[PDB]
């Protein structure tokens, strides 16, 4: 009956790094996605499994707002089926996805002068993540045949590395704060009419 807190997600002061994407649960509220579509601040807005113009016409069981930050070259791989680095070691979207993907420029928000090293991502992992998996654990990658199991070194790589965003960086390599909305088609409580 009350209005959903999409401002608690999109207008958040900061987003967790991609390897530990925040998972805000939205329910027991009436959602108005139109202000999302009609907003002119979104660089991208692509919904899979539902048309963007009919969002405030269906009714959803629950809403999950996976919020994180990646680079401009990495936004393209936030999509079902597509593989890469983000879609294989940080956040793999399921093949049968029924939600939305939102990303907008954040050059003046979370990219400080000289290089903001606050955002991290997983270069290496043993295998590809299952869809909707959070590998927050930071264990030394044993790339080589020597089981070091300790301080990083030769072929013992730290999996978490920083983007290092700068204001002078190119547009294609700039921080795009992604907010993947996920819906499921059962009692439903995050809709209006």
């Amino acid at each position: 009956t009350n209005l959903c807190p999409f401002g608690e997600v999109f207008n958040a002061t900061r987003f967790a790094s991609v390897y530990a994407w925040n998972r805000k649960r939205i329910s027991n509220c009436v959602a108005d996605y139109s202000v999302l579509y009609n907003s002119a601040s979104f660089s991208t807005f692509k919904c899979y499994g539902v048309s963007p113009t009919k969002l405030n016409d269906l009714c959803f069981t629950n809403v999950y707002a996976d919020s994180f930050v990646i680079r401009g070259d990495e936004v393209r791989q936030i999509a079902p089926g597509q593989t890469g680095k983000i879609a294989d070691y940080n956040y793999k979207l399921p093949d049968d996805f029924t939600g939305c993907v939102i990303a907008w420029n954040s050059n003046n928000l979370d990219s400080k002068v000289g290089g903001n090293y606050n955002y991290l991502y997983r270069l290496f992992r043993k295998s590809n993540l299952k869809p909707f998996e959070r590998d927050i654990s930071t264990e030394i990658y044993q790339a080589g045949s020597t089981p070091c199991n300790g301080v990083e070194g030769f072929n013992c790589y730290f999996p978490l590395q920083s983007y290092g965003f700068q204001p002078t960086n190119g547009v294609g390599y700039q921080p795009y704060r992604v907010v993947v909305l996920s819906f499921e088609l059962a009692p439903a409580t995050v809709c209006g009419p």
Partner: antibody, heavy 123, light 107 residues
Framework: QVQLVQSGAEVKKPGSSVKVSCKAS????????ISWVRQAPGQGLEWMGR????????NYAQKFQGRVTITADKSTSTAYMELSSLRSEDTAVYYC????????????????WGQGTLVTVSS | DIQMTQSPSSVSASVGDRVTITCRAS??????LAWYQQTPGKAPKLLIY???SLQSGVPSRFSGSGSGTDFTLTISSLQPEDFATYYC?????????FGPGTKVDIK
């Protein structure tokens, strides 16, 4: 026929810093790990720290950790070594050597080397 | 932290002789090794990697083998060009250590 070319023979006073370079002329940026090796005159080779330009990870030697930092500018394929607070008896002839990288595992055995910036504090 | 040490540096071989240089690792480095060659006024050129795989681009004279800690380098015939210092490093520990240096030279 990959060849590595460094800067000139930098001559800086003790306590300062240098920014010697190493241009990896030839070879893709995802197949070498630039490793810097120093040689004092009359003394055997000594290794400070490697960098992986494609990954960006760069772990150093515990003797030179913090003392020495390395940056790999993949835009122009010229790995940079910064000798912060060059003092004591650091005067040597610093080489740069690329250890081949296969897939994602570093291999070592520095094969292709530079000519060496003879960083010496002398007239 | 693996302090390597070769055979005594003083080696005298005129030409076409057999000069063997052996370096032993303080710790266990399996079969990893990289023998080099310090020509005077030039960068070392890799000779043997992994202690069994001979590097491409150098003669078959520069051969070595071994396992565990005791590693060897053998030269079938000392050509006049090979009047250089020979170094070995490890590929197990990350703080790579080069041996003190065995130099085959005139007296």
């Amino acid at each position: 026929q990959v060849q590595l070319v460094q800067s000139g023979a930098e001559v800086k006073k003790p306590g300062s810093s240098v920014k010697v370079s190493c241009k990896a002329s030839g070879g893709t940026f995802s197949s070498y790990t630039i490793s810097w090796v120093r040689q004092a005159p009359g003394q055997g080779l000594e290794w400070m720290g490697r960098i992986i330009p494609i990954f960006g990870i760069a772990n150093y030697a515990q003797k030179f950790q913090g003392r020495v930092t390395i940056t790999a500018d993949k835009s122009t394929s010229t790995a940079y070594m910064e000798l912060s607070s060059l003092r004591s008896e650091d005067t040597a002839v610093y080489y740069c050597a690329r250890t081949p990288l296969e897939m994602a595992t570093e291999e070592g055995y520095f094969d292709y080397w530079g000519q060496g910036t003879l960083v010496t504090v002398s007239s | 932290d693996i302090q390597m040490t070769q055979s005594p540096s003083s080696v005298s071989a005129s030409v076409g002789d057999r000069v063997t240089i052996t370096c032993r690792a303080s710790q266990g480095i399996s079969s990893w090794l990289a023998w080099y060659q310090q020509t005077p006024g030039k960068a070392p050129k890799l000779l043997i990697y992994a202690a069994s795989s001979l590097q491409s681009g150098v003669p078959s004279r520069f051969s070595g083998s071994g396992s565990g800690t005791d590693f060897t380098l053998t030269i079938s015939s000392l050509q006049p060009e090979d009047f250089a210092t020979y170094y070995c490093q490890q590929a197990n520990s990350f703080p790579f250590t080069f041996g003190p240096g065995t130099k085959v030279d005139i007296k």
